[PDB]
Amino acid sequence: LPNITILATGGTIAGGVENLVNAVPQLKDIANVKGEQVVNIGSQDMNDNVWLTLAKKINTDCDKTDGFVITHGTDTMEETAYFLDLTVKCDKPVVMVGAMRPSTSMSADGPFNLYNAVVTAADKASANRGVLVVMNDTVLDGRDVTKTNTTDVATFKSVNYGPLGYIHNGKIDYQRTPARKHTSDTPFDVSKLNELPKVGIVYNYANASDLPAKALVDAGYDGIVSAGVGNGNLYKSVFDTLATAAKTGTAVVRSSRVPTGATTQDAEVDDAKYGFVASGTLNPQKARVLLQLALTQTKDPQQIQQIFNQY
Amino acid sequence: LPNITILATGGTIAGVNAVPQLKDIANVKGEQVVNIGSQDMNDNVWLTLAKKINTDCDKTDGFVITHGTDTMEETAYFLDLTVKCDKPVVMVGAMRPSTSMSADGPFNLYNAVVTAADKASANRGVLVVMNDTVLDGRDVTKTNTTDVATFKSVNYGPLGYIHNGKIDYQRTPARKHTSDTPFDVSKLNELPKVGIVYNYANASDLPAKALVDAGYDGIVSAGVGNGNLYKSVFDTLATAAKTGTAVVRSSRVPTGATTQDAEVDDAKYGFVASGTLNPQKARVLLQLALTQTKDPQQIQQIFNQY
Amino acid sequence: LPNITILATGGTIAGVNAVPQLKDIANVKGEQVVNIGSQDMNDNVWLTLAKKINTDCDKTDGFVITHGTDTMEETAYFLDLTVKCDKPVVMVGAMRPSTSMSADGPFNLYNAVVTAADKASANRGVLVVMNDTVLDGRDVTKTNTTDVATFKSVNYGPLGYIHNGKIDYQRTPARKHTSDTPFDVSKLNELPKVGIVYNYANASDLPAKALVDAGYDGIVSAGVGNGNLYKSVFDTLATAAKTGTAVVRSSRVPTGATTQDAEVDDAKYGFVASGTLNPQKARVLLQLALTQTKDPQQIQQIFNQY
Amino acid sequence: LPNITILATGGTIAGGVENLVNAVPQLKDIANVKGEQVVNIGSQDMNDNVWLTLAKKINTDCDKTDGFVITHGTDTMEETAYFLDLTVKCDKPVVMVGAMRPSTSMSADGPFNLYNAVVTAADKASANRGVLVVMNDTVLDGRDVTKTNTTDVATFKSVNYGPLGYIHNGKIDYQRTPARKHTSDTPFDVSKLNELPKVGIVYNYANASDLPAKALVDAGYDGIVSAGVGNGNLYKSVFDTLATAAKTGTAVVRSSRVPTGATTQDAEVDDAKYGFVASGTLNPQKARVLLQLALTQTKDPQQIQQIFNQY
Ligand SMILES: N[C@@H](CCC(=O)O)C(=O)O
Ligand SMILES: N[C@@H](CCC(=O)O)C(=O)O
Ligand SMILES: N[C@@H](CCC(=O)O)C(=O)O
Ligand SMILES: N[C@@H](CCC(=O)O)C(=O)O
């Protein structure tokens, strides 16, 4: 049986971290499980320090186990998954899992999610697919997966390109793998980093104030992600502030508040004229992840656009 | 044939000579209210449309409002709450340029006029008609950045579908709209200041602080999950709510309700949960709620009724 | 607390001792009507349920019908048309075995009892409650073979969502149901014979012929696209319709309506278009239509009202 | 500019077949287009003869062009696409396209669909992805694509595993390719075949008659696909008839009328006991396609199951 390490970041999702083999006994039949509690927070409080800790821990311990399961709150699991997708250099399976119902509730989903997460982490076919999220019997790639519903146990979906595989009776039929470069195919190396560039997100809507953008500019933010309207469009005053900021060296990425589809280039905004970058299918919080990492290598917008075209 | 007024707010989405077939279904008159891209939509345009519709209700049988798609879902809900005409009011746009191949404008406008001319469309609130489907202004949202099929009432579904100029309506919104709401903008020249802040890992409190520092009347949080807030943002909005600012917890998550009685003790902090209203829609209702009350309990009641 | 009757048609989906929390929301009494897998569901079970509900309506405050998921969408629509009790009638099942990890039965049953106990659930027709969502028996269908979230009202959306034992109902079906329909099965021991044939490339006419040869009262076509038929199948159903057999064009396509006035001249052939009713649901209504009429125009009217 | 051949099977979808460069002039700017009318039928009348004609024509003419666009009715395009996905041996791009609105209607979708189909057929990156369906700005693989709505121009979706790529401004960001074996990676060779094994489809529902199944058995059908309920389940009398048939050498595949998800093995039906095959995510009409082709190589159910696990 394979050795699987569970890295916990929050409360339990089934039934300390060493107690999960008791909570979900069937795990014994599929893996030799060891648990470590990395942090214990709600994922609404996820932050750069925990991301760096997780990436370094996985990269350091890669040789000591056959795969990783990370238990994580669902609120920001899609952010952590993509960060790790880009910074983990272990090509053994790394699988994130959470639960939408409390472990104490009727029909709690945590136990079967964890079982299926371990199944996936133990499946040799899961390797080299990047970091994965396993929720509701489905294997999802860390780039495209997103929380689509506030309460549904089926909330996590790779809205644009679909899941990689479905799990039935502890076996996975994989039919897809992400084409975008991940893990050891990216140049992002966080092994020595203590911090990440500062990147904030502003929202666009009718009559939007420019004060959120201005405040981030005034604080010297390295980059700003716009949750635009439609195909990445900006309310005039937010546009104005970000246009000025970009000329001063602020990296500016146009993403969209629209939950599916790509903020494309060659649409309504002349990105080359303004020094902006279009985020593609990356939603604002995912665009932030890649923008922070891009900024550890380049402040040049054309090179950042190239990064957003490859990863 | 019904008299239908088209109120234009942007460029043409088609091209009445553009769509001659309108003549077969209505007597169409057009007035250009403003001409802007809807990414620049604003309070002033909203007030103008609501007043124009309420003033001209008796002069026509229904209204079509051509509009850019980017913020159509916001305008539709504002009008859904403030229009007192219960004749059909229908919003429509195009996802492809009117000069492009397989432009969607022409048939979208046609079906929008069909809807506004249909007696059965009355009393259903303000409507959005896109891709052969009639959608209520409360639940409708733009779900994809480029798809002609982008508009969907994601939580409760559409009211009806249009085939060959006929609508089979099977649903009507139960939340109170138009003449069933207390919001009256007839005499207002401005709306309370309400902004939106986004939550995400490591979120800065600076957007929230800047709105507070500017004396905003309300702040809508685009929370994570079921309305949750990053600690720094939580800290600032908790202070705002005890300091005069209405705080509504919505969610960046595209479907489902920011519920009461989850992880945030809204009663303790003075917060309001937005239900299925997404951030930009929650903003619409909060602004209007603030024209009537600043009490968080009374705003929650508004968010439970409209 | 309301008196709620649970009518079981299969094995347990949970395990009242199984779900003790029911005691907090209702006084639950259980009767096992049949015990079968719903892939074996049949006319006799349908008649029994409709009669039992109509007879015992006055003795209880609402009903939950535990049921296998495979044909739940069929039974729900039959009861939606034939139940004359307008107290809540709620159907529920489980997509995972009650002994498996994270079994969905227990919370599904709990929410089903919540729904049947909610005064606001009355007069909405027969309901299916699955994955925290209240769905009308007409539009609800099983959309995925294994997902706990499989049940969706794909065309018009759900009626309400359930959070913490509370439902926010925002919709109700406009099509006529329960006591608003003329279908009365109180005195019937059998239903007209109606079968379903599938269309696909190179489709054999032999399934259709076999139903005709057996004297079937009606045939539902699971057409391609908007109700279209493979030539051989067309030829046989055209003959059937002129020879005593009611023919309803539905579609294998999982969402959207088989419309009148598309590629098939239904008036010429004596056919009926099923609207948004999929094949198995179209069968339900056609059987009931046939207890009242054989006239294709009158059956089309039924398919436009129910 | 690449040479693209348009094989028409039905009426025009834009604006004879040689007239399409006039109907959609912008095609001139992206390809040298030549059209041939293979048949002219509505796709509700699609049949084995047209499938064989198309596969042989593409395999024969592969060296004479840079890619193929097949114009086809939408009703059965998902069947033809999968048949060709399994029998075309040209790994140059083969793209199917149709229109949901008549060419004469307001906002007809045919013209832009054809343009995008040619874009896809001309994109070198489209090669080696199997046979494709391009509809509503989306590139879909021929195995998973299905018509989900009776009238919506956005009807075609790869419901289980998602699209391969999206098209914006005549360029495609491909992020996925089908893992299941297609085209030159399958053993199905129709070059010499004049007919296909007879395979019919029966539907399951409450109180379902066994007469449709019996009739196909009595006619000596080589195989029967069950559009089962739920996870491939059968009404008792249909079950009985198909169980008997399988013991007599009839190939029996359990698919499902449920529009998404896989008819799995190891669920409610003991397929090994009965000699049945589970169709996986193949819906009934797609299962028919693979079953017919399997039957040109084997009547053994375990080998057919293996085929349904690989293709
Ligand atoms: N806010 C909690 C919700 C619980 C959960 O879904 O994990 C978290 O994200 O950690
Ligand atoms: N930004 C444009 C998009 C095009 C349109 O929808 O008309 C607008 O929303 O006005
Ligand atoms: N074939 C079973 C599936 C399990 C269930 O839904 O209870 C049935 O429909 O009865
Ligand atoms: N029955 C026609 C419909 C037209 C179409 O959508 O192509 C066909 O499939 O050919």
Numbering used by the authors:
A (entry chain C), D (entry chain C): 1 to 15, 31 to 326
B (entry chain A), C (entry chain A): 1 to 15, 36 to 326
Study text:
Each subunit is built-up by nearly 330 amino acids and consists of two α/β domains connected by a ca 21 amino-acid-long random coil. To obtain high-quality crystals, we took advantage of the highly stable N24S L-asparaginase, which shares identical catalytic and structural properties with the wild-type enzyme, but has largely improved stability and forms highly ordered crystals.
The ASU of the N24S–GLU complex, solved at 1.90 Å resolution, was similar to the one of apo-N24S: it comprised the 4 A, B, C, and D monomers, with chains A/C and B/D forming the two independent intimate dimers and the biological unit rebuilt using the crystallographic C2 symmetry operators. All the active sites contained clear electron density for the L-GLU ligand. Positions of L-GLU atoms were superposable for all protomers except protomer B, in which the L-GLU Cβ was 1.7 Å shifted with respect to the corresponding atom of the other ligands. As a consequence of the steric hindrance induced by L-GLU “misplacement” in the binding pocket, the catalytic residues T12, Q63 and E283 are shifted from the position usually observed in both the apo- and N24S–ASP structures (respectively). Additionally, w II, which is involved in the second step of the catalysis that resolves the enzyme tetrahedral and releases the deaminated product, is absent in three of the four protomers, being present only in protomer B, where L-GLU has a conformation more similar to L-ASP. According to the collected data, the ASFL closure is less efficient in the presence of L-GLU, very likely because of the steric hindrance deriving from the extra methyl group of the side chain compared to L-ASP.
